[PDB]
Scaffold this motif. Structure first.
Motif, PDB file in Angstrom:
ATOM      1  N   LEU A 175       0.826  -1.207   0.000  1.00 41.72           N
ATOM      2  CA  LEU A 175       0.000   0.000   0.000  1.00 41.72           C
ATOM      3  C   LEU A 175       0.859   1.256   0.000  1.00 41.72           C
ATOM      4  CD1 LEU A 175      -2.470  -1.454   2.638  1.00 41.72           C
ATOM      5  CD2 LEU A 175      -3.042  -0.963   0.250  1.00 41.72           C
ATOM      6  N   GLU A 176       0.673   2.111  -1.000  1.00 49.14           N
ATOM      7  CA  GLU A 176       1.401   3.373  -1.026  1.00 49.14           C
ATOM      8  C   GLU A 176       0.536   4.619  -1.205  1.00 49.14           C
ATOM      9  OE1 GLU A 176       4.144   3.337  -4.293  1.00 49.14           O
ATOM     10  OE2 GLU A 176       3.049   1.683  -5.291  1.00 49.14           O
ATOM     11  N   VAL A 177       0.807   5.633  -0.378  1.00 51.24           N
ATOM     12  CA  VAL A 177       0.301   6.992  -0.582  1.00 51.24           C
ATOM     13  C   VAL A 177       1.504   7.928  -0.688  1.00 51.24           C
ATOM     14  CG1 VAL A 177      -1.307   8.739   0.243  1.00 51.24           C
ATOM     15  CG2 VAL A 177      -1.590   6.368   0.965  1.00 51.24           C
ATOM     16  N   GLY A 178       1.897   8.244  -1.917  1.00 51.28           N
ATOM     17  CA  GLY A 178       3.157   8.934  -2.150  1.00 51.28           C
ATOM     18  C   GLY A 178       4.296   8.198  -1.453  1.00 51.28           C
ATOM     19  N   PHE A 179       4.947   8.896  -0.534  1.00 45.71           N
ATOM     20  CA  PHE A 179       6.078   8.378   0.223  1.00 45.71           C
ATOM     21  C   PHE A 179       5.669   7.430   1.361  1.00 45.71           C
ATOM     22  CE2 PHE A 179      10.485   8.650   1.263  1.00 45.71           C
ATOM     23  CZ  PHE A 179      10.578   8.553   2.642  1.00 45.71           C
ATOM     24  N   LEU A 180       4.383   7.381   1.685  1.00 48.24           N
ATOM     25  CA  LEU A 180       3.892   6.469   2.711  1.00 48.24           C
ATOM     26  C   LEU A 180       3.757   5.062   2.130  1.00 48.24           C
ATOM     27  CD1 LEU A 180       2.982   5.657   5.412  1.00 48.24           C
ATOM     28  CD2 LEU A 180       0.734   6.640   5.038  1.00 48.24           C
ATOM     29  N   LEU A 181       4.640   4.165   2.550  1.00 52.35           N
ATOM     30  CA  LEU A 181       4.670   2.798   2.044  1.00 52.35           C
ATOM     31  C   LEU A 181       4.422   1.849   3.209  1.00 52.35           C
ATOM     32  CD1 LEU A 181       5.258   0.668  -0.066  1.00 52.35           C
ATOM     33  CD2 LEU A 181       7.674   0.839   0.559  1.00 52.35           C
ATOM     34  N   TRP A 182       3.348   1.076   3.135  1.00 51.07           N
ATOM     35  CA  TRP A 182       2.967   0.310   4.304  1.00 51.07           C
ATOM     36  C   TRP A 182       2.128  -0.916   3.982  1.00 51.07           C
ATOM     37  CZ3 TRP A 182      -2.364   0.523   6.124  1.00 51.07           C
ATOM     38  CH2 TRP A 182      -3.198   1.197   5.210  1.00 51.07           C
ATOM     39  N   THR A 183       1.945  -1.754   4.992  1.00 46.86           N
ATOM     40  CA  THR A 183       0.881  -2.742   4.953  1.00 46.86           C
ATOM     41  C   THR A 183       0.304  -2.949   6.336  1.00 46.86           C
ATOM     42  OG1 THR A 183       0.191  -4.885   4.093  1.00 46.86           O
ATOM     43  CG2 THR A 183       2.176  -4.839   5.441  1.00 46.86           C
ATOM     44  N   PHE A 184      -0.734  -3.769   6.405  1.00 43.17           N
ATOM     45  CA  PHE A 184      -1.308  -4.139   7.691  1.00 43.17           C
ATOM     46  C   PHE A 184      -1.747  -5.593   7.671  1.00 43.17           C
ATOM     47  CE2 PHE A 184      -5.891  -4.573   6.959  1.00 43.17           C
ATOM     48  CZ  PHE A 184      -5.958  -4.128   5.628  1.00 43.17           C
ATOM     49  N   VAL A 185      -1.849  -6.184   8.855  1.00 41.17           N
ATOM     50  CA  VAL A 185      -2.405  -7.517   8.985  1.00 41.17           C
ATOM     51  C   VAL A 185      -3.253  -7.618  10.244  1.00 41.17           C
ATOM     52  CG1 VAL A 185      -0.470  -8.576   7.756  1.00 41.17           C
ATOM     53  CG2 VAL A 185      -0.451  -8.447  10.294  1.00 41.17           C
ATOM     54  N   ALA A 186      -3.968  -8.735  10.366  1.00 47.45           N
ATOM     55  CA  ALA A 186      -4.768  -8.999  11.536  1.00 47.45           C
ATOM     56  C   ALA A 186      -3.811  -9.160  12.691  1.00 47.45           C
ATOM     57  CB  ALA A 186      -5.587 -10.250  11.337  1.00 47.45           C
ATOM     58  N   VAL A 187      -4.254  -8.775  13.882  1.00 50.83           N
ATOM     59  CA  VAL A 187      -3.380  -8.663  15.046  1.00 50.83           C
ATOM     60  C   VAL A 187      -2.498  -9.881  15.319  1.00 50.83           C
ATOM     61  CG1 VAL A 187      -3.553  -9.025  17.498  1.00 50.83           C
ATOM     62  CG2 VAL A 187      -4.118  -6.819  16.568  1.00 50.83           C
ATOM     63  N   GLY A 188      -3.024 -11.076  15.103  1.00 46.00           N
ATOM     64  CA  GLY A 188      -2.223 -12.261  15.343  1.00 46.00           C
ATOM     65  C   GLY A 188      -1.213 -12.626  14.268  1.00 46.00           C
ATOM     66  N   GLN A 189      -1.201 -11.908  13.150  1.00 46.19           N
ATOM     67  CA  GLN A 189      -0.364 -12.306  12.020  1.00 46.19           C
ATOM     68  C   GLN A 189       1.018 -11.653  11.964  1.00 46.19           C
ATOM     69  OE1 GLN A 189      -2.016 -15.209   9.915  1.00 46.19           O
ATOM     70  NE2 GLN A 189      -2.018 -14.742  12.119  1.00 46.19           N
ATOM     71  N   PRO A 190       1.949 -12.292  11.244  1.00 48.10           N
ATOM     72  CA  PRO A 190       3.304 -11.771  11.013  1.00 48.10           C
ATOM     73  C   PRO A 190       3.397 -10.788   9.828  1.00 48.10           C
ATOM     74  CG  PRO A 190       3.102 -13.915  10.018  1.00 48.10           C
ATOM     75  CD  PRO A 190       1.813 -13.681  10.770  1.00 48.10           C
ATOM     76  N   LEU A 191       3.946  -9.611  10.100  1.00 49.17           N
ATOM     77  CA  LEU A 191       4.133  -8.598   9.076  1.00 49.17           C
ATOM     78  C   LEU A 191       5.346  -8.931   8.213  1.00 49.17           C
ATOM     79  CD1 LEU A 191       3.252  -5.765  11.499  1.00 49.17           C
ATOM     80  CD2 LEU A 191       2.060  -5.993   9.316  1.00 49.17           C
ATOM     81  N   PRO A 192       5.213  -8.774   6.887  1.00 49.75           N
ATOM     82  CA  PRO A 192       6.313  -8.941   5.917  1.00 49.75           C
ATOM     83  C   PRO A 192       7.528  -8.096   6.306  1.00 49.75           C
ATOM     84  CG  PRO A 192       4.256  -8.308   4.811  1.00 49.75           C
ATOM     85  CD  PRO A 192       3.988  -8.219   6.286  1.00 49.75           C
ATOM     86  N   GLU A 193       8.726  -8.615   6.088  1.00 53.81           N
ATOM     87  CA  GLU A 193       9.932  -7.861   6.381  1.00 53.81           C
ATOM     88  C   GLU A 193      10.251  -6.878   5.248  1.00 53.81           C
ATOM     89  OE1 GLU A 193      12.993 -10.693   7.388  1.00 53.81           O
ATOM     90  OE2 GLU A 193      12.093 -11.207   9.336  1.00 53.81           O
ATOM     91  N   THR A 194       9.782  -7.211   4.044  1.00 57.80           N
ATOM     92  CA  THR A 194      10.013  -6.427   2.833  1.00 57.80           C
ATOM     93  C   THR A 194       8.683  -6.226   2.085  1.00 57.80           C
ATOM     94  OG1 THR A 194      12.173  -7.540   2.581  1.00 57.80           O
ATOM     95  CG2 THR A 194      11.276  -6.414   0.616  1.00 57.80           C
ATOM     96  N   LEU A 195       8.540  -5.129   1.342  1.00 55.08           N
ATOM     97  CA  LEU A 195       7.469  -4.997   0.367  1.00 55.08           C
ATOM     98  C   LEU A 195       8.061  -4.901  -1.011  1.00 55.08           C
ATOM     99  CD1 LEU A 195       4.754  -2.619   1.851  1.00 55.08           C
ATOM    100  CD2 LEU A 195       4.674  -5.064   1.410  1.00 55.08           C
ATOM    101  N   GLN A 196       7.364  -5.468  -1.989  1.00 57.39           N
ATOM    102  CA  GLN A 196       7.741  -5.331  -3.384  1.00 57.39           C
ATOM    103  C   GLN A 196       6.756  -4.389  -4.028  1.00 57.39           C
ATOM    104  OE1 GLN A 196       8.258  -8.292  -6.177  1.00 57.39           O
ATOM    105  NE2 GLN A 196      10.141  -9.147  -5.267  1.00 57.39           N
ATOM    106  N   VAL A 197       7.265  -3.271  -4.525  1.00 58.77           N
ATOM    107  CA  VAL A 197       6.433  -2.265  -5.150  1.00 58.77           C
ATOM    108  C   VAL A 197       6.317  -2.533  -6.651  1.00 58.77           C
ATOM    109  CG1 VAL A 197       6.107   0.174  -5.632  1.00 58.77           C
ATOM    110  CG2 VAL A 197       7.110  -0.536  -3.446  1.00 58.77           C
ATOM    111  N   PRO A 198       5.080  -2.631  -7.141  1.00 56.06           N
ATOM    112  CA  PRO A 198       4.733  -3.017  -8.515  1.00 56.06           C
ATOM    113  C   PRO A 198       4.624  -1.881  -9.528  1.00 56.06           C
ATOM    114  CG  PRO A 198       3.034  -3.641  -6.866  1.00 56.06           C
ATOM    115  CD  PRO A 198       3.905  -2.607  -6.259  1.00 56.06           C
TER     116      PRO A 198
END
Length: 107
Positions: A83-106
């Motif tokens: 997920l990107e909003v200009g320079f804001l690059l992020w993701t989210f998951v459900a509270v119990g889940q593991p967040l990705p260490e890297t994002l691949q921007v398409p």
């Protein structure tokens, strides 16, 4: 309920608990729940509606891309996706889940 992570700039690697329900990301602490310090970030940068079902786009300083595609205003967002909003690059998951260490921007 939901946790997000940032992948770029000053807050890279930081994980944040998302409040219910109206949630603002921005550089202006008077208007924002989650305060980002990068200069690329608007006073009010991203506004989400948050509940236990999911998270919907409300407003953004710039178009929100999900996996590289613009997201219409009231859309529900995909957990785990790029997920990107200009320079804001992020993701989210459900509270119990593991967040990705890297994002691949398409670009």
């Amino acid at each position: 309920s939901w946790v997000c992570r940032f992948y770029q700039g000053k807050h890279r690697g930081v994980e944040v608990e998302l409040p219910h329900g109206r949630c603002v990301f921005g550089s202006d602490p008077l208007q924002s729940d989650i305060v980002l310090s990068d200069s690329e970030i608007a006073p009010v940068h991203l506004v989400l509606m948050v509940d236990e079902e999911g998270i919907r786009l409300t407003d953004s300083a710039e178009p929100l891309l999900q996996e590289g595609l613009p997201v219409p205003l009231g859309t529900l967002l995909r957990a785990g996706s790029c997920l990107e909003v200009g320079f804001l690059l992020w993701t989210f998951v459900a509270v119990g889940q593991p967040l990705p260490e890297t994002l691949q921007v398409p670009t």
